Each structure stands twice: as structure tokens, then as C-alpha cells.
Design a protein around this motif. Structure first.
Motif, PDB file in Angstrom:
ATOM      1  N   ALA A   1     -34.076 -21.479  38.444  1.00  0.00           N
ATOM      2  CA  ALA A   1     -35.044 -20.436  38.133  1.00  0.00           C
ATOM      3  C   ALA A   1     -35.254 -20.208  36.650  1.00  0.00           C
ATOM      4  O   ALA A   1     -36.380 -20.339  36.166  1.00  0.00           O
ATOM      5  CB  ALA A   1     -34.617 -19.114  38.777  1.00  0.00           C
ATOM      6  N   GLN A   2     -34.207 -19.869  35.910  1.00  0.00           N
ATOM      7  CA  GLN A   2     -34.346 -19.543  34.501  1.00  0.00           C
ATOM      8  C   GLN A   2     -33.594 -20.578  33.687  1.00  0.00           C
ATOM      9  O   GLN A   2     -32.428 -20.868  33.963  1.00  0.00           O
ATOM     10  CB  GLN A   2     -33.814 -18.145  34.192  1.00  0.00           C
ATOM     11  CG  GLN A   2     -34.603 -17.031  34.847  1.00  0.00           C
ATOM     12  CD  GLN A   2     -33.956 -15.678  34.661  1.00  0.00           C
ATOM     13  OE1 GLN A   2     -32.745 -15.577  34.474  1.00  0.00           O
ATOM     14  NE2 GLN A   2     -34.762 -14.626  34.711  1.00  0.00           N
ATOM     15  N   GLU A   3     -34.272 -21.121  32.680  1.00  0.00           N
ATOM     16  CA  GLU A   3     -33.754 -22.234  31.904  1.00  0.00           C
ATOM     17  C   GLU A   3     -33.864 -21.913  30.423  1.00  0.00           C
ATOM     18  O   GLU A   3     -34.640 -21.050  30.009  1.00  0.00           O
ATOM     19  CB  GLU A   3     -34.501 -23.536  32.217  1.00  0.00           C
ATOM     20  CG  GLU A   3     -35.883 -23.616  31.599  1.00  0.00           C
ATOM     21  CD  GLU A   3     -36.991 -23.439  32.617  1.00  0.00           C
ATOM     22  OE1 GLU A   3     -36.856 -22.567  33.501  1.00  0.00           O
ATOM     23  OE2 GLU A   3     -37.999 -24.170  32.531  1.00  0.00           O
TER      24      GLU A   3
ATOM     25  N   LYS B   1     -22.577 -12.359  46.143  1.00  0.00           N
ATOM     26  CA  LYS B   1     -23.415 -11.258  46.604  1.00  0.00           C
ATOM     27  C   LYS B   1     -24.883 -11.504  46.275  1.00  0.00           C
ATOM     28  O   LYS B   1     -25.762 -11.241  47.104  1.00  0.00           O
ATOM     29  CB  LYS B   1     -22.933  -9.945  45.989  1.00  0.00           C
ATOM     30  CG  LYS B   1     -23.093  -8.733  46.893  1.00  0.00           C
ATOM     31  CD  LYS B   1     -22.589  -8.995  48.312  1.00  0.00           C
ATOM     32  CE  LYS B   1     -21.120  -9.423  48.338  1.00  0.00           C
ATOM     33  NZ  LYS B   1     -20.526  -9.307  49.698  1.00  0.00           N
ATOM     34  N   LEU B   2     -25.165 -12.014  45.075  1.00  0.00           N
ATOM     35  CA  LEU B   2     -26.538 -12.341  44.710  1.00  0.00           C
ATOM     36  C   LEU B   2     -27.114 -13.406  45.632  1.00  0.00           C
ATOM     37  O   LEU B   2     -28.263 -13.298  46.079  1.00  0.00           O
ATOM     38  CB  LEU B   2     -26.590 -12.808  43.256  1.00  0.00           C
ATOM     39  CG  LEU B   2     -27.914 -13.383  42.752  1.00  0.00           C
ATOM     40  CD1 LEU B   2     -29.003 -12.326  42.763  1.00  0.00           C
ATOM     41  CD2 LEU B   2     -27.745 -13.973  41.362  1.00  0.00           C
ATOM     42  N   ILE B   3     -26.328 -14.440  45.930  1.00  0.00           N
ATOM     43  CA  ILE B   3     -26.800 -15.521  46.791  1.00  0.00           C
ATOM     44  C   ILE B   3     -27.059 -15.004  48.199  1.00  0.00           C
ATOM     45  O   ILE B   3     -28.072 -15.340  48.825  1.00  0.00           O
ATOM     46  CB  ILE B   3     -25.794 -16.684  46.783  1.00  0.00           C
ATOM     47  CG1 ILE B   3     -25.794 -17.350  45.408  1.00  0.00           C
ATOM     48  CG2 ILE B   3     -26.121 -17.692  47.870  1.00  0.00           C
ATOM     49  CD1 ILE B   3     -24.561 -18.144  45.105  1.00  0.00           C
ATOM     50  N   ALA B   4     -26.152 -14.173  48.717  1.00  0.00           N
ATOM     51  CA  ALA B   4     -26.344 -13.609  50.047  1.00  0.00           C
ATOM     52  C   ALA B   4     -27.586 -12.730  50.104  1.00  0.00           C
ATOM     53  O   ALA B   4     -28.360 -12.799  51.065  1.00  0.00           O
ATOM     54  CB  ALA B   4     -25.106 -12.819  50.464  1.00  0.00           C
ATOM     55  N   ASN B   5     -27.800 -11.902  49.078  1.00  0.00           N
ATOM     56  CA  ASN B   5     -28.977 -11.040  49.063  1.00  0.00           C
ATOM     57  C   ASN B   5     -30.262 -11.852  48.989  1.00  0.00           C
ATOM     58  O   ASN B   5     -31.231 -11.555  49.699  1.00  0.00           O
ATOM     59  CB  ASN B   5     -28.898 -10.064  47.890  1.00  0.00           C
ATOM     60  CG  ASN B   5     -27.830  -9.012  48.081  1.00  0.00           C
ATOM     61  OD1 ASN B   5     -27.429  -8.715  49.205  1.00  0.00           O
ATOM     62  ND2 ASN B   5     -27.364  -8.438  46.981  1.00  0.00           N
ATOM     63  N   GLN B   6     -30.294 -12.876  48.133  1.00  0.00           N
ATOM     64  CA  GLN B   6     -31.489 -13.707  48.036  1.00  0.00           C
ATOM     65  C   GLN B   6     -31.756 -14.443  49.341  1.00  0.00           C
ATOM     66  O   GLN B   6     -32.909 -14.553  49.771  1.00  0.00           O
ATOM     67  CB  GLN B   6     -31.352 -14.700  46.885  1.00  0.00           C
ATOM     68  CG  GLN B   6     -31.424 -14.100  45.502  1.00  0.00           C
ATOM     69  CD  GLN B   6     -31.184 -15.134  44.423  1.00  0.00           C
ATOM     70  OE1 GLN B   6     -30.671 -16.216  44.694  1.00  0.00           O
ATOM     71  NE2 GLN B   6     -31.557 -14.807  43.193  1.00  0.00           N
ATOM     72  N   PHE B   7     -30.704 -14.953  49.984  1.00  0.00           N
ATOM     73  CA  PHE B   7     -30.867 -15.623  51.269  1.00  0.00           C
ATOM     74  C   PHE B   7     -31.421 -14.671  52.320  1.00  0.00           C
ATOM     75  O   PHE B   7     -32.326 -15.028  53.085  1.00  0.00           O
ATOM     76  CB  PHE B   7     -29.530 -16.205  51.724  1.00  0.00           C
ATOM     77  CG  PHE B   7     -29.543 -16.718  53.130  1.00  0.00           C
ATOM     78  CD1 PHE B   7     -30.086 -17.952  53.426  1.00  0.00           C
ATOM     79  CD2 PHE B   7     -29.023 -15.956  54.163  1.00  0.00           C
ATOM     80  CE1 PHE B   7     -30.103 -18.420  54.721  1.00  0.00           C
ATOM     81  CE2 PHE B   7     -29.040 -16.418  55.458  1.00  0.00           C
ATOM     82  CZ  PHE B   7     -29.581 -17.651  55.738  1.00  0.00           C
TER      83      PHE B   7
ATOM     84  N   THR C   1     -30.336 -21.616  33.643  1.00  0.00           N
ATOM     85  CA  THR C   1     -29.349 -20.555  33.539  1.00  0.00           C
ATOM     86  C   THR C   1     -29.290 -19.685  34.781  1.00  0.00           C
ATOM     87  O   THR C   1     -28.320 -18.941  34.951  1.00  0.00           O
ATOM     88  CB  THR C   1     -29.640 -19.663  32.325  1.00  0.00           C
ATOM     89  OG1 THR C   1     -30.926 -19.051  32.480  1.00  0.00           O
ATOM     90  CG2 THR C   1     -29.631 -20.482  31.049  1.00  0.00           C
ATOM     91  N   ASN C   2     -30.298 -19.764  35.643  1.00  0.00           N
ATOM     92  CA  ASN C   2     -30.346 -18.945  36.843  1.00  0.00           C
ATOM     93  C   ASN C   2     -31.112 -19.691  37.925  1.00  0.00           C
ATOM     94  O   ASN C   2     -31.936 -20.565  37.642  1.00  0.00           O
ATOM     95  CB  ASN C   2     -30.977 -17.584  36.551  1.00  0.00           C
ATOM     96  CG  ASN C   2     -30.549 -16.523  37.533  1.00  0.00           C
ATOM     97  OD1 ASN C   2     -29.862 -16.803  38.511  1.00  0.00           O
ATOM     98  ND2 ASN C   2     -30.943 -15.287  37.265  1.00  0.00           N
ATOM     99  N   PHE C   3     -30.853 -19.308  39.173  1.00  0.00           N
ATOM    100  CA  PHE C   3     -31.343 -20.028  40.341  1.00  0.00           C
ATOM    101  C   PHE C   3     -31.827 -19.044  41.397  1.00  0.00           C
ATOM    102  O   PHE C   3     -31.587 -17.838  41.307  1.00  0.00           O
ATOM    103  CB  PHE C   3     -30.249 -20.926  40.923  1.00  0.00           C
ATOM    104  CG  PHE C   3     -29.071 -20.164  41.450  1.00  0.00           C
ATOM    105  CD1 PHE C   3     -28.033 -19.813  40.606  1.00  0.00           C
ATOM    106  CD2 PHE C   3     -29.009 -19.774  42.773  1.00  0.00           C
ATOM    107  CE1 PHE C   3     -26.953 -19.105  41.072  1.00  0.00           C
ATOM    108  CE2 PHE C   3     -27.931 -19.061  43.242  1.00  0.00           C
ATOM    109  CZ  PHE C   3     -26.902 -18.728  42.389  1.00  0.00           C
TER     110      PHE C   3
END
Ligand SMILES: *[C@@H]1O[C@H](CO)[C@@H](O[C@@H]2O[C@H](CO)[C@@H](O)[C@H](O)[C@H]2NC(C)=O)[C@H](O)[C@H]1NC(C)=O
Ligand SMILES: *[C@@H]1O[C@H](CO)[C@@H](O[C@@H]2O[C@H](CO)[C@@H](O)[C@H](O)[C@H]2NC(C)=O)[C@H](O)[C@H]1NC(C)=O
Ligand SMILES: *[C@@H]1O[C@H](CO)[C@@H](O[C@@H]2O[C@H](CO)[C@@H](O)[C@H](O)[C@H]2NC(C)=O)[C@H](O)[C@H]1NC(C)=O
Ligand SMILES: *[C@@H]1O[C@H](CO)[C@@H](O[C@@H]2O[C@H](CO)[C@@H](O)[C@H](O)[C@H]2NC(C)=O)[C@H](O)[C@H]1NC(C)=O
Ligand SMILES: *[C@@H]1O[C@H](CO)[C@@H](O[C@@H]2O[C@H](CO)[C@@H](O)[C@H](O)[C@H]2NC(C)=O)[C@H](O)[C@H]1NC(C)=O
Ligand code: NAG
Ligand code: NAG
Ligand code: NAG
Ligand code: NAG
Ligand code: NAG
Lengths: 117, 415, 98, 49, 49
Positions: B338-340, B189-195, B11-13
Motif C-alpha cells: 500500500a504505502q511505499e 489486529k490490523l490484518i484481522a480488521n482489514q480482512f 512500508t504498508n500493505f
């Protein structure tokens, strides 16, 4: 360097002497081998021309048209500001070529034509 | 928790950036065999001349090794025919590349990570030859590769550099790993912040640990140890009265000085052959490493590899190169689910006696209702005839489950 | 033997290498390729094969309509492996040569 | 009287011995967790015994 | 001289074994932990597992 009163010589990590003490006068003078390196001949094809340049590797231009590069002293080679594709690799970013009247030249090699996306 | 009707779907990565260090080149050490064996001694030189080609071929082997080192560096880094440059405006959709992009303020045009990498790695006929490409030229090559990857994706590798907005490139990378590209734009935005956070942690990870650059430092240490042992071998007697050639020449007349010099020549020539053989073997290892690095730059950086664990753990997204003393460092950006959640599944669905199979994705159930989701990210959709295809019947498929398949043409006909 | 030549035991024993292979086998059987990328995600083994079938360009219904035949052929191929190996000595030469 | 030859040979053999363990580690230790199959062997007819 | 010969042969054979171990690690990563699309990398036919 400061020698202890009984110390006379200086042995390098291979039994060669870097430093020494004279019998006539007690002043201690360090020793370094005069100079040595590798002579290399930069030439084009003899079919093309018979002009050459001589690179004394890893040495200055004093112990030996005398451009002093980081590879060593380049004798006979014209220094050219223009960059080109490396034809004869010399080293430390320097390459040589035979170009037009014609002569051998040394230049900082180009990494390719610049671009921007 | 395996069972015949249960699946776990993420559900999340997370964005994961991992570091891979590969040696590329050795120090170009050249040895003058005659000077090493017979230091400016005509008597010894004339005696060494009696062994024929034993001396010259060692120099030939070392010259071949040095040329191979330059060839290795060129193969790894000179993979691009043009020097690409990033635009002065860093409008990359929130992705911050300032930590791998060259820094103009510094005297050298190196990125902060490249400087951190460079700061963490450290007269007997022996010389060292400078590499053909300087550190600044390797930095220019890595900067060109970086700009090409950032502004053109994989296009600059296959052909000409075709510009594309970086979020659109990331959507391409998403579709490459089987995750639908809307997941990127919905979570940009989440992907950019994590990167950005993952890139930021790389500096600390490399700097704090002092053995992170162990591969390159071990290469340097091995070469230094070999050279030091070769130098130390000159103090050995090898059965002669003195390890000093000048002492033997000053003490003895030629008839026995020649015997002592012959003993020294045998010992020192054996030392040179041992050194050259070890250098050849180590050069073979370094050449294998450089070939692997060139393959990784071609397939990880210039493209998107589907080979598992070739470009780091997780599903490969992209890689960024960084120069390092005697080697290269790849920063691999990958997807880690990440979350499953644990769902029930079915291989097909019986609607009218016909079996429905998902065109892409998997049937899942949240206890009461059935949906079809993409395999690598939980995103439930209503099961329709545009998500599924028909083949066979419900009497053949084992474990098929009764459900209703929505037809979007029926209410259009009714209305 | 008694001339200064010794052999050192490997760090991983045969039991530990067997455990590693067992873990890899269990991960492959119960989670497909998900255990390698990140968290292991369970998936029915019969459902895992169509995904593998999809990778080679063959549709899922090909495996679901022929599941029994495919399972029987796989079992027969595994039995054959054991038979071949014990029956022909040369097989494990690449190791023995070493 | 021959210097480090003995030491160099010993060092090379030690390096080879360490490299063997490195080889085994890189081949087999590619999974962080030790997974186990359940006592249920219902894999749809596939026999992994 | 006998020891030097033995050590040189051992170094060359160790390099060969290292190449084989690297190939085995690559095969375990790409064919056991995934489904490789490389032809003949993991058997004749179309690789499944
Ligand atoms: C990319 O990240 C760097 C930090 O890693 C940012 O640089 C910082 O910018 C702020 C201003 O917003 C300054 O107060 C900090 O001193 C800067 N730090 C460093 C180390 O330079 C940079 O602004 C970011 N770029 C973008 C486009 O967001
Ligand atoms: C997926 O995980 C990310 C974290 O990796 C979540 O983003 C965080 O959300 C919390 C709120 O619960 C915030 O406090 C954090 O600041 C967020 N982190 C970042 C980096 O943005 C995200 O919400 C999760 N998404 C889902 C659907 O569960
Ligand atoms: C599975 O999802 C379905 C569809 O969303 C859920 O059914 C909905 O439940 C929510 C909240 O109770 C309602 O807003 C919707 O009206 C329901 N839709 C329908 C068509 O019934 C269902 O609750 C979920 N099942 C479980 C157990 O979580
Ligand atoms: C799915 O629905 C079908 C019918 O739509 C069910 O098949 C029926 O089975 C019952 C009891 O065996 C019979 O009385 C009917 O005649 C069958 N109908 C048909 C068309 O075969 C089937 O049982 C349902 N599947 C499940 C497991 O619920
Ligand atoms: C998997 O195959 C093995 C054989 O390869 C089966 O074990 C056999 O079971 C029969 C009973 O039906 C015995 O008579 C044999 O002696 C067994 N052979 C061995 C080598 O153990 C096993 O039952 C099969 N498992 C499943 C789930 O089908
Ligand atoms: C002469 O005597 C000794 C011999 O080496 C020397 O130390 C001394 O300095 C000499 N006299 C001088 C240099 O005045
Ligand atoms: C030797 O070369 C250096 C440059 O590396 C130069 O500064 C120096 O002047 C040269 N030799 C001398 C003694 O001048
Ligand atoms: C090359 O440019 C530099 C600039 O100082 C200088 O060497 C000179 O102007 C040029 N070379 C010549 C004059 O041939
Ligand atoms: C799903 O259920 C199984 C049953 O034991 C459990 O082990 C697993 O952790 C569950 N998954 C989640 C995401 O809760
Ligand atoms: C799964 O296995 C259970 C036995 O534990 C069985 O009752 C059920 O029918 C099976 N379902 C499928 C879809 O194979």
C-alpha cells in the motif's frame, strides 16, 4: 381465463392450443398434454442378478414398492434410510445400488464420512 | 521514476478480497426427438423411421451432455473425501468468518454470501432433469472445504487434516509470499480488521451491482433462448400447407399428407440437429469453465498458488469457495502493498575489499545510513555478517558502495 | 464482398495494442513484477536480474560478477531473434494459418 | 417459412465477433496504467531498443 | 445448408481461438507479469523473464 366474445381458441408459443371454447356450451376449458417422460431401468450386472427397478422420469406415481422421489416415480426399488457412496446415480440426491437376500435399493447418497478438526 | 540507484519499497500493505465467478454446469435438458417431430402421429412416426439413426443419436448426444454436467459439478466440488466442521468456538485470532460460514438459523445451511448469490441469479417432448447433487449438497461440500481451509490450512488437501492455529496459518501464508512472518504477529489486529472489512464489502459489492453475476445469468439466458427458439420452430411451415401436424392429418388423405409430413419432418429434424450442435459447443465451453474452476479450487483454495493473477490481483494468500446456481464463486484474499518510500540502493557493500551481498532482502539507504530490508516490506536492520555473505571483491561488482559491516562476534571476543 | 459478407473492425486498433504492449514492457523493465501485484515500485534493472537469478536458484553474485557477459549475451540473443524471423518465412505460421 | 434459422445464424456470428474483442481485451489489457520508459536508457548494459 | 455449415465451422474455430487466447492471457500474466516456475511453460531452460 376469460375469453373476449369473438375469441374462441388459445395459441401457445409454438401453435399448440392451451385453452379452448366448446360449440355446444360456451364455457372455456384449458388443455394440457396427458403426460410424458423417460423410462429408465436401474439394474445391477446381469452376471450378478436379474432384478430391476423402473424409474418413470419427471412424473408422479399415479399416472403410471412405489417410492415417489423428486427424479420421478421409482417402482421396484426399496427405500433405505442409510446413505452410501453413489453407485448408480438416479438424480436429485438419490442413488441406487444392488446390496444384500440381495436386492436393488435407493437412498440419498452420502457426501463422505463426516469429520471435525 | 526509474534510476540506476533508486528503489521503492512498501512500508504498508492491505488485505484485498476479490470475487471470481465461474460457471460449472448447464441445465440438463433432454429432448424426445420423436415427440418433438411427430407428436403422437403413427403416420409421421413411420415416416420418421425412414431416416434411420438421425433421431436416436441426438438423444444420445443430449444424454452425454447431461452426464458431463453432473461430472463437471462433481469434479469442481467433490474434491474432499471427508466432511469437516468448524469448532463451535470461533477463536480464530480476530478473523471473522461468519459471513462465509454456513448459517444454521436459516432453513438451508447456506452462508449469508451464498444466499445473496442465490437470490441474484434466476410440453413438446422437452424435459429437464434434476442435477445429481442438490444445492444443499453443494453447500455441504463448500462448507467442508471452508472448514478444512480454516482449521488445517493446506494439509487437508495433501493428506490428513492437521490442525493449526489460524494466525499461525497466516504466518505460513506470509512466508509463502516472501514477507517475514513477524510482520503478521506484529500487525495481527490490523490484518484481522482489514480482512473483516474486505469480507464485509463483498456482500455490498455483489448485491448493489446487478450485473455482478453476469456469467451465470448469461449461461441461463443462453440455455433458455436455445430452448425457446427450438419451441418456436414448431410453428414454421417449412413449405408445408400447415405447421400443425394434426391439421394435415385431418385435411389430407395419406398420399399427399405424407408429402406434407415429409416437409415438416425435414424442417423439424434440421431444427433438432441445429439445437444439438449448439448445445454440444456450449457444453464444451462450460466443460472448459468447470475444468478451470476445479483447477482453481485445487490450487487457490486447497493450496497457495504462486501463479501471478491466477488467484486474483496481488500476492495470493488464500481463497474461499462459495456455491452459486450453476457455478462457483471464489473469494481470493491477497496482499497488496500500500504505502511505499523511495530509497537509494547498492548491489553490494565493500567492507575490507570483500563484497557483501544480502542473503535475503536488499540494501537500502535513508540518506546517511545503510540497512538491509526484506524486499516486500520496509523493515530496516543493521548490516551484519549474519545478514550478508561474502563473494568476490569490490573491483568486479559495478556500483558497489563503501560501508561498514557489523560483526557480532567481535564485541563478544572483546568483552 | 457484395453478397452480404462484411468484416467489422476490431475495437482495439493496432496502435492501441502496441501501446498496451509498450506499457507492459515499460512496467517489466522499470519495476519487475511489482506493477502486476499492486503499485509499480522502481528497481534498477541490473538489480532486478539477480532477483530473477535467485528465483532459478542462482546466487546474486553470479550476476554481479558476470554482469557484462550476461548483458552482451542478452543483446546478442535479441539481435538473433530479428535475424531468424526475417530470414525464415515459416516462423509466423501459427498466425498466418488462422 | 423457415422461422428463425436466419436469426440464429446472425446471432451466432455476432457472438463470435464479440468474443474476438473479448479475447484481445483479456490478453492485452492486463495493466491499468500506461507506463513509459524514461529517456535514460542506462539499464546496466542491457539494450532494449 | 451452406450457411449452417459455415457457421458451425466458425463456431468450432472460434472455440479453438478462445482456448489459444486464454493460454496467451495466462502466459502474459504468469511470465510477463511474473517469474514462472513451471517447466517449459515459457521457454527451454530456467525462466527469467
Ligand atoms: C462477525 O461479524 C458479524 C457482523 O458481520 C457480527 O455479528 C454482529 O454482532 C453484533 C454483536 O457484537 C450484533 O450487534 C450484530 O447485530 C451482529 N450482526 C449480524 C449481521 O449478525 C459477529 O459478532 C462477528 N463475529 C465475531 C466473532 O466478531
Ligand atoms: C497502515 O495502514 C493502515 C490503514 O490501512 C493504518 O491503520 C489505520 O491507522 C489510522 C491512524 O492513522 C487509524 O485511524 C485507522 O483506524 C487505522 N485503520 C485500521 C483498519 O486499523 C496503519 O496505521 C498503517 N501503518 C503504518 C505503519 O503506516
Ligand atoms: C536513518 O536512520 C538512522 C538510524 O536510526 C538515523 O540516525 C538516528 O537518528 C535518530 C533521530 O535523529 C537518533 O535517535 C539516532 O541516535 C540516530 N542514530 C545514529 C546511529 O546516528 C538517521 O537520522 C536516519 N537518517 C535520516 C536522514 O533520516
Ligand atoms: C572505498 O574505500 C576504498 C579504500 O578503503 C577506496 O579505495 C581507495 O581509493 C583511493 C583514491 O583512489 C586510494 O588513494 C586508495 O589507495 C584506495 N584504497 C584501496 C584499498 O584501494 C575507494 O575509493 C572507496 N570507494 C569510494 C567510491 O569511496
Ligand atoms: C542497441 O542496439 C542497437 C542495434 O541493435 C544500436 O543501434 C546501432 O547503433 C550504431 C552506433 O553505434 C549504429 O551504427 C547502428 O546503425 C544502430 N543500429 C540500429 C538498428 O539502430 C544501439 O546504439 C544500441 N543501444 C545501446 C544503448 O547500446
Ligand atoms: C344449442 O344451440 C347452440 C349450439 O351450440 C348452443 O350454444 C346452445 O347452448 C344449445 N342449447 C343449449 C345448450 O341449451
Ligand atoms: C404428485 O406429486 C406431488 C409431490 O410433488 C404430490 O403432492 C401429489 O399428491 C401427487 N399427485 C397427486 C395428484 O396427488
Ligand atoms: C427412516 O426414518 C424415517 C423417520 O420417520 C422413517 O422413514 C422411518 O422411520 C425409517 N424408514 C423405515 C421405517 O424403513
Ligand atoms: C520518490 O522520488 C520520485 C522522484 O520523482 C517520485 O516520483 C516518487 O513519487 C517518490 N516516491 C515517494 C514514495 O514519494
Ligand atoms: C548511475 O548513473 C549516473 C549517471 O546519471 C552515474 O553518474 C552513476 O555513476 C551511476 N551509478 C551506478 C551505480 O551505476
Amino acid at each position: 381465463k376469460k375469453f373476449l366474445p369473438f375469441q374462441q381458441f388459445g395459441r401457445d408459443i409454438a401453435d399448440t392450443t392451451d385453452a379452448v371454447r366448446d360449440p355446444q356450451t360456451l364455457e372455456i376449458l384449458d388443455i394440457t398434454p396427458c403426460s410424458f417422460g423417460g423410462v429408465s431401468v436401474i439394474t445391477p450386472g446381469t452376471n450378478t442378478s436379474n432384478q430391476v427397478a423402473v424409474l418413470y422420469q419427471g412424473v408422479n406415481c399415479t399416472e403410471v414398492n412405489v417410492f415417489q422421489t423428486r427424479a420421478g416415480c421409482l417402482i421396484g426399488a426399496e427405500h433405505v434410510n442409510n446413505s452410501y457412496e453413489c453407485d448408480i446415480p438416479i438424480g436429485a440426491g438419490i442413488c441406487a445400488s444392488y446390496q444384500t437376500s440381495q436386492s436393488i435399493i435407493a437412498y440419498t447418497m452420502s457426501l463422505g464420512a463426516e469429520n471435525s478438526v | 521514476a526509474y534510476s540506476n540507484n533508486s528503489i521503492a519499497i512498501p512500508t504498508n500493505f492491505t488485505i484485498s478480497v476479490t470475487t471470481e465467478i465461474l460457471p460449472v454446469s448447464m441445465t440438463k435438458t433432454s429432448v424426445d426427438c420423436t415427440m418433438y417431430i411427430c407428436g403422437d402421429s403413427t403416420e409421421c412416426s413411420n415416416l420418421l423411421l425412414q431416416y434411420g439413426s438421425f433421431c436416436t443419436q441426438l438423444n444420445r448426444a443430449l444424454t452425454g451432455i447431461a452426464v458431463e454436467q453432473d461430472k463437471n459439478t462433481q469434479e469442481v466440488f467433490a474434491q474432499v473425501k471427508q466432511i469437516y466442521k468448524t469448532p463451535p468456538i470461533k477463536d480464530f485470532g480476530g478473523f471473522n468468518f461468519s459471513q462465509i460460514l454456513p448459517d444454521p438459523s436459516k432453513p438451508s445451511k447456506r452462508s449469508p454470501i451464498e444466499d445473496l448469490l442465490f437470490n441474484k441469479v434466476t410440453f413438446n417432448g422437452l424435459t429437464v432433469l434434476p442435477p445429481l447433487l442438490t444445492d444443499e449438497m453443494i453447500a455441504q461440500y463448500t462448507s467442508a472445504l471452508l472448514a478444512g481451509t480454516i482449521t488445517s490450512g493446506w494439509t487437508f488437501g495433501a493428506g490428513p487434516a492437521l490442525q493449526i492455529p489460524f494466525p499461525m496459518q497466516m504466518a505460513y501464508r506470509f512466508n509463502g509470499i516472501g514477507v517475514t512472518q513477524n510482520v503478521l504477529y506484529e500487525n495481527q489486529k490490523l490484518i484481522a480488521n482489514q480482512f473483516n472489512s474486505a469480507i464485509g464489502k463483498i456482500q455490498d459489492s455483489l448485491s448493489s451491482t446487478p450485473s455482478a453475476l453476469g456469467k451465470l445469468q448469461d449461461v441461463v439466458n443462453q440455455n433458455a433462448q436455445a430452448l425457446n427458439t427450438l419451441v418456436k420452430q414448431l410453428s414454421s411451415n417449412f413449405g408445408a400447407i400447415s405447421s400443425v401436424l394434426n391439421d394435415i392429418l385431418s385435411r389430407l388423405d395419406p398420399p399427399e399428407a405424407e408429402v406434407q409430413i415429409d416437409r415438416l419432418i425435414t424442417g423439424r429434424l434440421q431444427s433438432l440437429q441445429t439445437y444439438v450442435t449448439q448445445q454440444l459447443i456450449r457444453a464444451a465451453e462450460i466443460r472448459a469453465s468447470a475444468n478451470l474452476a476445479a483447477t482453481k479450487m485445487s490450487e487457490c483454495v486447497l493450496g497457495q498458488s504462486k501463479r501471478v493473477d491466477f488467484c486474483g490481483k496481488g500476492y495470493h494468500l488464500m481463497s474461499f469457495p462459495q456455491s452459486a446456481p450453476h457455478g462457483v464463486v471464489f473469494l481470493h484474499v491477497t496482499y497488496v502493498p500500500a504505502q511505499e518510500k523511495n530509497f537509494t540502493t547498492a548491489p553490494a557493500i565493500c567492507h575490507d575489499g570483500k563484497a557483501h551481498f544480502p542473503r535475503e532482502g536488499v540494501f537500502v539507504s535513508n540518506g546517511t545510513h545503510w540497512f538491509v530490508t526484506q524486499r516486500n516490506f520496509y523493515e530496516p536492520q543493521i548490516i551484519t555478517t549474519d545478514n550478508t555473505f561474502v563473494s568476490g571483491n569490490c573491483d568486479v561488482v559495478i556500483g558497489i558502495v563503501n560501508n561498514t559491516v557489523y560483526d557480532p562476534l567481535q564485541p563478544e571476543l572483546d568483552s | 464482398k457484395f453478397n452480404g459478407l462484411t468484416v467489422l473492425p476490431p475495437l482495439l486498433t493496432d496502435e492501441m495494442i502496441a501501446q498496451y504492449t509498450s506499457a507492459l514492457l515499460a512496467g517489466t523493465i522499470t519495476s519487475g513484477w511489482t506493477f502486476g501485484a499492486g503499485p509499480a515500485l522502481q528497481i534498477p534493472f541490473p538489480m532486478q536480474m539477480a532477483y530473477r537469478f535467485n528465483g532459478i536458484g542462482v546466487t546474486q553474485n553470479v550476476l554481479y560478477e558476470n554482469q557484462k557477459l550476461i548483458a552482451n549475451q542478452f543483446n546478442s540473443a535479441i539481435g538473433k531473434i530479428q535475424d531468424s524471423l526475417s530470414s525464415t518465412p515459416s516462423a509466423l505460421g501459427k498466425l498466418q494459418d488462422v
